[PDB]
Amino acid sequence: RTRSIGLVIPDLENTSYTRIANYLERQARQRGYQLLIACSEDQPDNEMRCIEHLLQRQVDAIIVSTSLPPEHPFYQRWANDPFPIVALDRALDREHFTSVVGADQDDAEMLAEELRKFPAETVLYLGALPELSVSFLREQGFRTAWKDDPREVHFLYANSYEREAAAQLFEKWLETHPMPQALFTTSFALLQGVMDVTLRRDGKLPSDLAIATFGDNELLDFLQCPVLAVAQRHRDVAERVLEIVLASLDEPRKPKPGLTRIKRNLYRRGVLSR
């Protein structure tokens, strides 16, 4: 018992990953537990050797944000091992592992519902990679909240969650369609790409546009238009990840396998901050 827990995440650049890591250090410290942060750079072969190293260092448990398809036999080596692997953000096998993931569909609905309360006649939903679970859940949540609404919603789907991708698509789309009055993006990078176009196009960011977005950034408070943004409950998420880790280590018997979801917070920024 080294009184330590490994934490495998893509990087410590993503402020979402870092924030959860921050609240996790602070909490683990407190219970007299050391965090060993091993970064996979989101690569499967990287992730597995990171796992190995934590195992050699006699870590007492690993918290993973996996890069491999959970199915993928790497982790089924511990499917019936009392050694705890607790998953974050990207779920591990629903039947042998507990996983703390976000509530994307509920999140998307909530954000969507709020945005609809805005007078806008042309509303545009910008997203990426419709095939992925996250992309899908968000679109579902959004459709849930707009069904009986009489307006039509244009859907636009970039081939990646990158800002440069989004600018190209939106600029092209502007050729056939006029500027929207309600916007819904499913990642901050996608919202940036749009603004690059709106700024290059108008010389100035909008005041006359309702924006709803995933991710949050306090600098959105300087916008001159209404803005809605959702972000994780980083401390709340850190609490349960760790609470599960110690429940398996200390209690006789492990917590139930399966998923547990934490909702995001809605933040009203831009002109809604005044």
Added chain:
Amino acid sequence: RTRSIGLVIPDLENTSYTRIANYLERQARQRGYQLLIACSEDQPDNEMRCIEHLLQRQVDAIIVSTSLPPEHPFYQRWANDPFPIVALDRALDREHFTSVVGADQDDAEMLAEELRKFPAETVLYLGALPELSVSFLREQGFRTAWKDDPREVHFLYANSYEREAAAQLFEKWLETHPMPQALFTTSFALLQGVMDVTLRRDGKLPSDLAIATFGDNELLDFLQCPVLAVAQRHRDVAERVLEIVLASLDEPRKPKPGLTRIKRNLYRRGVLSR
């Protein structure tokens, strides 16, 4: 030999701290070294218990960003010990320890003569806590580059490096003086403070004002005025810190004690970005 290195920093919220941490983990793991992050929350008592903890865990070396004043007797317990304690950002005893620190004076000057290149009649230098070494170095650097300049620079000094200290001060100052045409802030938070009033005052952020700042954020690209900002070379700093750690670990002799300064990068944002 645990083949591990402790890292004591205030927190994992400070973007500059986290980025250096990111480039440090990834470089340590590659060299086959595990990082253990302990956070001091910037409290001296917290810092010292951390260092105890890292040492009990047979860490091979500590990288510290200390909250103690440079020659404090806590650290002289290792003044002549071959155990490597390497300092980051905030220097340890300049004669028995290596410290990898910024070139605040050089950086401030460089930023300053860049700013002076802009046609602006009323230039204001906003800062905080003039008596601290870092604050002093910045003012020194700035005066160096504006010394022969025939133009007047009113100086303004908040009692803290915080955003609403800045907003109150600048707003109060506006009553007695009209709007500047060049601005120089010594921290991003101070720059935010300004924009809060500039937005509350004008209802829209400026297009007509040359901005120079310490700290950086890519979102500054959307501003409609010229912007210059200076930030650490995170990877560069992480690289040398760790090179010193290993040069200390492997070589029969220690590296020279003392400081080594790494210059910040200049980034041109706002209207300078397009």
